[PDB]
Design a protein around this ligand. Sequence first.
Ligand SMILES: [Mg+2]
Ligand SMILES: [Mg+2]
Ligand SMILES: [Mg+2]
Ligand SMILES: [Mg+2]
Ligand SMILES: [Mg+2]
Ligand SMILES: [Mg+2]
Ligand SMILES: [Mg+2]
Ligand SMILES: [Mg+2]
Ligand SMILES: [Mg+2]
Ligand SMILES: [Mg+2]
Ligand SMILES: [Mg+2]
Ligand SMILES: [Mg+2]
Ligand SMILES: [Mg+2]
Ligand SMILES: [Mg+2]
Length: 60
Amino acid sequence: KNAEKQAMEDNKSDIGWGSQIRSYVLDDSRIKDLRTGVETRNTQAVLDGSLDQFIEASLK
RNA sequence: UGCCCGGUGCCGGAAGGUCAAGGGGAGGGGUGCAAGCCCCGAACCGAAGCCCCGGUGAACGGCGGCCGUAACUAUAACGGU
Ligand SMILES: [Mg+2]
Ligand SMILES: [Mg+2]
Ligand SMILES: [Mg+2]
Ligand SMILES: [Mg+2]
Ligand SMILES: [Mg+2]
Ligand SMILES: [Mg+2]
Ligand SMILES: [Mg+2]
Ligand SMILES: [Mg+2]
Ligand SMILES: [Mg+2]
Ligand SMILES: [Mg+2]
Ligand SMILES: [Mg+2]
Ligand SMILES: [Mg+2]
Ligand SMILES: [Mg+2]
Ligand SMILES: [Mg+2]
């Protein structure tokens, strides 16, 4: 199991720069989910919990 | 060749506590007609030792536990007790 634990550690990573899946930029009001990728302009509405816009569209 | 002198040992301490023989003799008793003779006996004075106050490890000896915490884990330099 600890070998499987390190498999998680070694396959996640790394809360670092070149490592985004979505980019919430509050200085020009956008949240690009650079995976798919939607471009909703309601930044302070996504921070309130409107992730359906992303979840359902990113289950593909 | 580190840290611990609380326990034991040794060393130092004319204070204080306790301390035997002895000294002392408030008081009490036996007996005698009696002077007397004989026996207990409090306060108080009275050594070392012990207590007490310190020192001492190349003196006898002794030198912990639990809990949490860091770039996603592990570990814990750090903290709490
Ligand atoms: Mg110390
Ligand atoms: Mg000692
Ligand atoms: Mg000693
Ligand atoms: Mg001592
Ligand atoms: Mg002595
Ligand atoms: Mg006497
Ligand atoms: Mg006498
Ligand atoms: Mg008489
Ligand atoms: Mg006497
Ligand atoms: Mg003495
Ligand atoms: Mg002793
Ligand atoms: Mg030594
Ligand atoms: Mg000891
Ligand atoms: Mg940690």
